Amino acid sequence: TKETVYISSIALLKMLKHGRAGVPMEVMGLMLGEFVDDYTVNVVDVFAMPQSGTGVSVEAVDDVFQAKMMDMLKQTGRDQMVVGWYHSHPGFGCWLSSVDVNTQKSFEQLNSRAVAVVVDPIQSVKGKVVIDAFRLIDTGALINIQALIHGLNRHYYSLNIDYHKTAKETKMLMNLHYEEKEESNLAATKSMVKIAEQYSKRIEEEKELTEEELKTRVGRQDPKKHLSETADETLENNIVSVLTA
């Protein structure tokens, strides 16, 4: 019931990339990973099904290309379990499709269990992520139990996602931002070009405050607030330039 999903952020972003552009369509395709003992949903990989001009369906799944890949992937050494289903569900918290369920449901057959990964690629882009994976049924549970034996299990029923990568790509990630020296000091020592503004910016701060202080004579805009946050933003940015000179 508390179940451990694990993603290759690669596969994550791979999907995202595929999913981000996938709008409108729910993106479709494999989900490469495994289950380490229980709870454990591993993902090394995933991939697009190629566009479905029939849209997402239990049908639109083609296992040809997977094998093709999977071979070339096997050739790549790339091999996993297909662990479930991940699609791009514009403005969808909700649930994907009972179809998608049935789609998966047909498929989680092929596993002990699978997922259908909810993604709103819209709501994903927010700088935080929007996502879920359903697989709606249990063994018992973390062992949930009753509605299955009582039949009629339907719901959202998420799984519990996680993922892992490494400190390795983390670097290569945080490598984002020769280099620094070329990248940094010296690369943005450009200031003085704006000294006028840099003045004027600082200049403008002044006025805002006589104003602000004045009200001292209720709630925010308060006479002693934006003052610092204002005259404090031009203080530093104006000191960093000194490093160059």
């Binding site: 003992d37 709870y39 454990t40």
Partner: protein, 189 residues
Amino acid sequence: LLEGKKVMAPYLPGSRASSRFIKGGSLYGLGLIYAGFGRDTTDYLKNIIVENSGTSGDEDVDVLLHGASLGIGLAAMGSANIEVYEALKEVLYNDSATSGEAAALGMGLCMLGTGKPEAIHDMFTYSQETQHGNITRGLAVGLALINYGRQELADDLITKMLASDESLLRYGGAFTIALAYAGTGNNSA
């Protein structure tokens, strides 16, 4: 100190149960009474463990293993028997998130104390080595277990645990530092 066994007797293995896990519960549930005093039954169970140790990935067994793998170090706690550690070590190494988890504990329970660094290595090794959340996790405990009162001792592993990217080592490190420094405050710690 008697009946509890007889209490578990109906739910002991070989008296079957409804569930293997019910059947497993006695195993652990046993030493609850007998902690320190049931080592024999424990070792007996350990034998049953040892019996199923190197095999039988049945969840039923796993639990049966696990529930035993629970009750083993339970009584064996504070009792240093490599076997306890050992028999689990592979039960551990058998990598049943079910079973090997309890192993990650009982083994510690065995060597809970200064324990041995080699387990520590291996634990710490297995930790990173063994692939599971919890199996990896509970190892931290056994570390913390077999790092107990040691204080300055485990600091390296602590540091190593500290050095863990993962919680789990860092995680246990705290407990380790606890079982090391628990009670008396080491301010720095």
